[PDB]
Structure formats: C-alpha cells, structure tokens
Write a protein that holds these residues in place. Sequence first.
Motif, mmCIF file in Angstrom:
data_model
loop_
_atom_site.group_PDB
_atom_site.id
_atom_site.type_symbol
_atom_site.label_atom_id
_atom_site.label_comp_id
_atom_site.label_asym_id
_atom_site.label_seq_id
_atom_site.Cartn_x
_atom_site.Cartn_y
_atom_site.Cartn_z
ATOM 1 N N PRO A 49 0.809 -1.236 0.000
ATOM 2 C CA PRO A 49 0.000 0.000 0.000
ATOM 3 C C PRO A 49 0.843 1.287 0.000
ATOM 4 O O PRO A 49 0.349 2.346 -0.382
ATOM 5 N N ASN A 50 2.124 1.192 0.365
ATOM 6 C CA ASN A 50 2.985 2.379 0.532
ATOM 7 C C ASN A 50 3.724 2.724 -0.760
ATOM 8 O O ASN A 50 4.924 2.492 -0.914
ATOM 9 N N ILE A 51 2.967 3.304 -1.682
ATOM 10 C CA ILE A 51 3.472 3.559 -3.050
ATOM 11 C C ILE A 51 2.984 4.891 -3.648
ATOM 12 O O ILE A 51 3.048 5.095 -4.859
ATOM 13 N N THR A 75 -5.946 -8.167 -2.807
ATOM 14 C CA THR A 75 -5.254 -9.131 -3.675
ATOM 15 C C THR A 75 -4.446 -10.124 -2.827
ATOM 16 O O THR A 75 -4.536 -11.334 -3.043
ATOM 17 N N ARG A 76 -3.705 -9.593 -1.862
ATOM 18 C CA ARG A 76 -2.885 -10.436 -0.971
ATOM 19 C C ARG A 76 -3.753 -11.299 -0.056
ATOM 20 O O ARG A 76 -3.492 -12.486 0.128
ATOM 21 N N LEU A 77 -4.874 -10.722 0.374
ATOM 22 C CA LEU A 77 -5.866 -11.448 1.187
ATOM 23 C C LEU A 77 -6.468 -12.623 0.419
ATOM 24 O O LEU A 77 -6.469 -13.747 0.916
ATOM 25 N N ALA A 78 -6.761 -12.373 -0.857
ATOM 26 C CA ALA A 78 -7.289 -13.388 -1.777
ATOM 27 C C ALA A 78 -6.279 -14.533 -1.987
ATOM 28 O O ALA A 78 -6.607 -15.711 -1.971
ATOM 29 N N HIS A 79 -5.009 -14.160 -2.066
ATOM 30 C CA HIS A 79 -3.935 -15.156 -2.237
ATOM 31 C C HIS A 79 -3.710 -16.021 -0.999
ATOM 32 O O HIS A 79 -3.582 -17.245 -1.108
#
Lengths: 99, 196, 97
Positions: free
Chosen positions: B1-3, B101-105
């Motif tokens: 998120p830090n982008i 996305t990471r949660l889904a993975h």
Amino acid sequence: PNIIGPQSGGAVENLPLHQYEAMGEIQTKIPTEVMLTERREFELSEEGFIGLVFRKDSDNAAFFSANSTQKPRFFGNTPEGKAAETNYRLGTQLPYMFI
Amino acid sequence: PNIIGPQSGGAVENLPLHQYEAMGEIQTKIPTEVMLTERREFELSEEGFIGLVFRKDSDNAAFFSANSTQKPRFFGNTPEGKAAETNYRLGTQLPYMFIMTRLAHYIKVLQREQIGSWKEKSDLERELNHWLSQYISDMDDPAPAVRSRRPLRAARVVVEDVEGQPGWYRCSLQVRPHFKYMGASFTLSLVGKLDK
Amino acid sequence: MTRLAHYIKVLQREQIGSWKEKSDLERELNHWLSQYISDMDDPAPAVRSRRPLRAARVVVEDVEGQPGWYRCSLQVRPHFKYMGASFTLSLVGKLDK
C-alpha cells in the motif's frame, strides 16, 4: 547444552598448523578447508548445517550453533502464534534436545 | 500500500540528469519529458492515469496517487448513498486493491490446506476471525506507517451454509483499511477575541 | 497569512500518501502551528516579531463520500500593531496618589 560458543564450550582448541611458501611470502594451510565469514556461517545455520568456523590467524575453531536438520515452522503473528513458534524452535535446536 | 507519496514510498530517487547549453545559460533535460504542475497531475488523476511527477530542480520524482482506470460511480446524497460512494472509491484505487489481492492469495492457499477437516459453520467463523485479526491494528493511534505492516483497522466475517450441499459454505469478508492522506481544503481566517 | 499559506502548501504535499486519519491531522497541525505562537503574559516587544501569532485554532472534518480527503479550518489571532489612540487630559484635586 554447553557446546555452542567460543567461551561457552563449543570452541575446538589446538588445531594442526602448516606454514608454507605463498607468492614469495608465508601462509598456513587453514585447519578447515575455508575461513568461514559470519554471513556465510549464518547462511549455513539457516540451512540446518553445523559449520565449524575457523578463528582467523589462530589454531582455534568454534561451533556458533548446533541447529538440527529440522526446519522451523511459521505461525500466525499473534500472542498464541508466536508462543507456538518459540516452542517449535526450541525443539529444532540440539542444545535443548539434549536436555 | 505504501506507493503514493514523496515520504510514504512513492518517491523515485536517483534520476539521470543532463546539463546542456540553453540560450547562453545552462539547463538540465528533465528526467521526465515535462515538469508536471499540481493542477495538471490532478487532472490526469481524474482521468485515471498514474502520472510520475518530477520534483523541480532535483533528480527525484513521485507518484502522488495510483488510481486505476475505473471511473468512480456517483450515488444519491444520502447517508447510505455516500457510504456507497466511499466503498466504491476504495475499490477504484490500487493502494487498497493490493490489500484485497494479498488477502485473496492467502485465503486460496491456506484454505486448501483445511479441505477435509471436520468444520461446521461456526468453526469457520471462529477460525477465520482469529486468522484475519493477524493483519488488524485497531489501536487508538498506531505508530504512523506501522499501520503499514497491519493495513486493516476492522474486519467482519459471516459464514452461511450452501443449502442442499453439506460441507460447502458461503463466506463474506468485509474490511476497513487505514486511510491514505490524499488531499485537503484549508480555510484561513484572521480573528480577534479567539479562544486562547 | 500569506506565509502560512505557503508553508501549508509545501509541507502538506510532503505528507500526501501517509496514513492519516481525521484526528491525526488535528494533532500534527496543532503541533505545527504552535511553532509560530507566542502566548506568554508579556513577550519581549518586537520579539513577538519572530512569532507573529498569539493564538490559533484548528478543526478538521471529513469530506463525506471521499475517503482520504479532509476539510481543515485554520483561524489565528495575531499580535496587534499600535496604530492610533485618543487622549483625555484632566487636572484634578484629591486624586488617589
């Protein structure tokens, strides 16, 4: 349990030495094939090897740690999960399994 | 998120520079084709582009925001309508979609390991709740950008049964991520007899 | 106010992308503005100069249906310049000493 330190009692003292000619200078054949760096020792420790490191310019070597072959398990980052990791890691190390 | 920030971690450091003669003076070829103004960046952001702006007189550029192509939907100006807009806008921004996305993975992987286990409906609610808490930072004031490792503030899980299919469940996962600072309006005013 | 506007524009752009909730802005903005405040009983005259403000108030609200955006109000009470006065002179007997 006292088998994992230069002072703790994982130190190997009185290694054979062999001074011979180098490129016009003199050097001793390292008692171990190589002079393992701290970073390389740590890498080997991560891969569950027991690396006997050589103390540079001496006849002393040491076992910095005695991790078993077993790979540590990762748990959820919670109070209980971290406690599980602590307990499992104790199991993975020989200094505690000997107890 | 830090982008998405000069300080947050959307800053691009160490750009090539090239000083050359101008009209008798010297100037450097801008690392990006142009020196994007704040107004022009904002315009591009509205049109769902990710503009890498150049920091004038330096070798640093920054991504002020990472909006996706998707255009936000407008809803009726009511309590529910504005909540709908809030939820939809979160979906339109990449800094938040990366979390999902990471949660889904993680769900796909970790859940396959659980197939075959003795799980009743409430067993999934109990375990899924304990799992999601792993990435939640629900404190009064978590250290700024520490919230980073724990992107979520709140989350809710409900599990129901797929009727006429024993062993199958329908799960709903809703999350409230910490908010990125992405703009503000200021009203300045001189005043006498202001409360001290 | 002009210099305050210039500082806010610059310093705030640096903060874009940071994890800021509504009350986070109120906390930080308050700590910032205090930098130029001299709220003492009697600051050295023309020293008040480097710290032009005496008091200031900040409120932050949320732009409803736009998460990450805020509405900030900044009000300030500057030290006053001496710019005129009226005098009433009077002779008097039995004045309190």
